[PDB]
């Protein structure tokens, strides 16, 4: 046997992140502000890249999963926490988008608890 | 407000 | 400006119902074209209108007739259809609200009498 290769596969935790955690969040009513990277020019957002130096969004997390960018579920959880905290840092605490982020994070934390 | 409108973001 | 049975209906039934709808919020206040980065908005929309302005006009007895209030709704909805693409999300929101608008207006009292 010259080449004992086998097809690339995700871990059970990474498969869970994709088919359960992200699927559930993407379907949530308040997830749509998090589908794409923040466009600070289009959205007229002062100082966004000055304050938020590691941008993250669910579209990027989704695609990193579908393109096998991740090698461990912990990296995917870190991207999710970066997404939520960026939104908490930049916006005012009473802003709707923060309450939306908080609602998604609760479901995220609840789903990660259910994980193997 | 505005940011969600952009409407969500800008209240 | 007057208080009428029909304008009372527009304030206490039509606006009340529409304001609570899940898709009403983009219509709560005038479009701020500078803040939202829509630099062509006022070259395309000559007569802005929004449901917050309608609500205040009802509250300040601005209208002489519910006919004028309904025109304001028509202006708000058709401004949205003109400025935006038929597949934009805000257009589907406007269509949902206009559908409820139509069902409430159908039950408005047919004769307008001043209070």
The CA distance from A102 to A81, in Å, is 11
DSSP string of C14-38? IIHHHHHSTT-GGGSS---TTTTT-
Residue A64 C-alpha, separation from nearest chain C C-alpha, in angstroms: 26
Phi, psi of A19 (to 5 degrees): -80, -15
Chains that touch C (3 or more CB pairs under 8 A): A, B
* Residue to test with chain B: of C24, C27, C36, most B Cβ within 10 A: C36
CA torsion angle C26 C27 C32 C33 (round to 10): 80
Experimental determination technique: X-ray
Q: Which residues contact C75 (CB under 8 A, 6 or more apart)?
A: C47, C49
Coil/strand/helix, residue B9 = strand
The CA distance from A10 to A71, in Å, is 7
Residues 8-37 of A with CB under 8 A from C: none
Where along chain A do its domains lie?
Answer: 12-114
Q: Which of C111, C115, C113, C109 is nearest to C9 (CA)?
A: C109
To what resolution in angstroms was this structure determined? Answer: 1.9
Q: Which residues contact C94 (CB under 8 A, 6 or more apart)?
A: C27, C77, C80, C81
Residue C26 C-alpha, separation from nearest chain B C-alpha, in angstroms: 7
Residue B2 C-alpha, separation from nearest chain C C-alpha, in angstroms: 7
Burial profile B1-11: b = 16 or more Cβ within 10 angstroms, e = fewer: bbbbbbbbbbb
**What is the widest separation between alpha-carbon atoms in chain A?**
63
Chains that touch A (3 or more CB pairs under 8 A): B, C
CATH of domain A12-114: 1.20.920.10
Name chain C contacts of A42, Cβ cutoff 8 Å: 37
Q: Which fold has domain C5-107?
A: Histone Acetyltransferase; Chain A (1.20.920)
Residue C70 C-alpha, separation from nearest chain B C-alpha, in angstroms: 25
Residues A79, A64: contact at Cβ < 8 Å? yes
Residues A65, A22: contact at Cβ < 8 Å? yes
By CB neighbour count within 10 A (0-12 exposed, 13-18 middle, 19+ buried), where does C101 fall? buried
**C36–B2 C-beta distance less than 8 A:** yes
Q: Which of C39, C36, A30 is nearest to C50 (CA)?
A: C36
Q: Which of C52, C109, C102 is nearest to C74 (CA)?
A: C102
- Cβ of residue A46 closer than 8 Å to a chain C Cβ: no
């Amino acid at each position: 046997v010259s080449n004992p290769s086998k097809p690339g596969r995700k871990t059970n935790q990474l498969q869970y992140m994709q088919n359960v955690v992200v699927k559930t969040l993407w379907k949530h009513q308040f997830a749509w502000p998090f589908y794409q990277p923040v466009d600070a020019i289009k959205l007229n957002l002062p100082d966004y890249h000055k304050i938020i130096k590691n941008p993250m969004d669910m579209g990027t997390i989704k695609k990193r999963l579908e393109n096998n960018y991740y090698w461990s579920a912990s990296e995917c959880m870190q991207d999710f926490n970066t997404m939520f905290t960026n939104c908490y840092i930049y916006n005012k605490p009473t802003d709707d988008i923060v309450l939306m982020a908080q609602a998604l994070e609760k479901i995220f934390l609840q789903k990660v608890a259910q994980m193997p | 407000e505005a940011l969600l409108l952009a409407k969500l973001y800008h209240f």
